[PDB]
């Protein structure tokens, strides 16, 4: 199975070639078609599996590149992962003109540029959400990257608050290496008939 076999088109395929990705990882082969098809996905995988591209590639391909406003919001537990994911998203979109990524963990002028992808930690995202500097009215895709870690670090209240402010019509991808009950409950509250992927 190739990346083109998963339904990815030339701009993303070219970025993958620039990055030296030769073939999809298992989590990518399983998750990418579901997300391209507009499903919610519960992905059980950890760093090293390729989970970042698994959620990033399909949601990038699915956005409106001419809409200069946040369409993909990615929640991460740490400044380090937020920055890493934003860098990856920037690399995957290298051949998508006018598509821009912001990491929030300087922040004001980031959001004023109308980035289509915003990656951040829950506390800092929730600050800009309350301030109105973060517009989620046009959001199409929500990712929780390491939901179990956000729970464990004490951030789940803020995660829930963010998730309850998102407009009805959106895709959700939730990635978690483990499955605490509180994450099961988040899946039931906030996701629509999710495809569960554990290999």
Using CB under 6 A, which of the segments 49-57, 62-70, 115-123, 181-189 binds ligand AMP? 49-57
Q: Which of 144, 141, 168 minimizes the C-alpha distance to 156?
A: 144
Q: Which residue has the tokens 């591209």?
A: 53
47 binds ligand AMP per the rule CB under 6 A = yes
The CB-nearest residue to ligand AMP is 52
* Distance between CA atoms of residues 8 and 96, nearest Å: 13
52 binds ligand AMP per the rule CB under 6 A = yes
| Annotated binding residue 82 | no
Using CB under 6 A, which of the segments 42-50, 100-108, 149-157, 183-191 binds ligand AMP? 42-50
CB 156 within 8 A of CB 182: yes
Q: Which residues of 44-72 are buried (b: 16+ CB within 10 A; e: fewer)?
A: bbeeebbbbbbbbbbbbbbbeeeeeebbb
- Closer CB to ligand AMP, residue 175 or residue 190? 175
Q: Dig out the tokens for 148 from the structure.
A: 């179990």
- Closer CB to ligand AMP, residue 23 or residue 131? 23
| Smallest separation (angstroms) from ligand AMP to the CB of 67 | 26
What are the residues binding ligand AMP (CB under 6 A)?
21, 24-25, 28, 47-53
């Amino acid at each position: 199975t190739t990346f083109a076999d998963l339904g990815l088109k030339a701009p993303i395929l070219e970025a993958l070639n620039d990055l030296g990705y030769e073939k999809p990882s298992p989590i990518q082969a399983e998750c990418i078609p579901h997300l391209l098809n507009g499903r919610d996905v519960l992905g059980m995988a950890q760093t090293g599996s390729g989970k970042t591209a698994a959620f990033s590639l399909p949601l990038l391909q699915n956005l409106d590149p001419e809409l200069k406003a946040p369409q993909i919001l990615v929640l991460a537990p740490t400044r380090e992962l937020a920055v890493q994911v934003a860098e990856a998203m920037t690399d995957f979109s290298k051949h998508m003109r006018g598509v821009n990524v912001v990491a929030l963990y300087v922040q004001l002028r980031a959001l004023r540029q109308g980035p289509q992808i915003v990656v951040g930690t829950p506390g800092r995202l929730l600050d800009h959400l309350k301030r109105g500097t973060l517009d989620l009215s046009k959001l199409s895709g929500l990712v929780l990257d390491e939901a179990d870690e956000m729970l464990r670090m004490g951030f789940i209240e803020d995660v829930e608050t963010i998730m309850a402010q998102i407009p009805e019509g959106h895709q959700t991808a939730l990635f978690s290496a483990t499955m605490p009950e509180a994450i099961r409950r988040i899946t039931r509250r906030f996701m629509k008939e999710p495809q569960e992927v554990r290999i």
